[PDB]
Design a protein. Structure first.
Length: 154
């Protein structure tokens, strides 16, 4: 029914790292770093791998902060997105043809140029909350319906 994805937010006390994707799913929006989990890889190892592949950063310590299921009406496959945070990174963000990382101060997060669900759950991530979410989209711009709940265990 659902396909596993990861999403990693590099969140420091006064700034967050976002990446502008060049092509494919979500091109032209700022987002965290992530993608599909591979065969024989754990969700957390997938999250670490996608952070390096897309940002050039090395993370050791990840922690789980959320699980969000996305439905696109007319598309059979649900996206089961496992969301992680770190403050604890090595390396310099790498701009590549696929991805342009930038730091944002926490009061200048570019919500109008992000997926619209981020306006709902990012405020929970910034206050160190953990959450379970479901968003039903019509195409890439319109949230038809959603649920979002804070939890003590992701």
């Amino acid at each position: 029914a659902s396909r596993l994805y990861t999403l990693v937010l590099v969140l420091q006390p006064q700034r967050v790292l976002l990446g502008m994707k060049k092509r494919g799913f979500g091109a032209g929006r700022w987002n965290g770093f992530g993608g599909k989990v591979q065969e024989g890889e754990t969700i957390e190892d997938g999250a670490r791998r996608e952070l390096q592949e897309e940002s050039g950063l090395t993370v050791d310590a990840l922690h789980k902060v959320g699980q969000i299921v996305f439905e696109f009406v007319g598309e059979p496959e649900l996206m089961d997105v496992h969301v992680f945070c770190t403050d604890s990174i090595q390396g310099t963000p790498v701009e590549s043809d696929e991805m342009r990382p930038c730091w944002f101060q926490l009061d200048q997060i570019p919500f109008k140029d992000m997926w619209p669900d981020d306006s709902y759950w990012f405020p929970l991530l910034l206050q160190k909350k953990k959450f379970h979410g479901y968003f039903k989209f019509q195409g890439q711009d319109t949230i038809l319906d959603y649920t979002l709940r804070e939890v003590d265990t992701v």
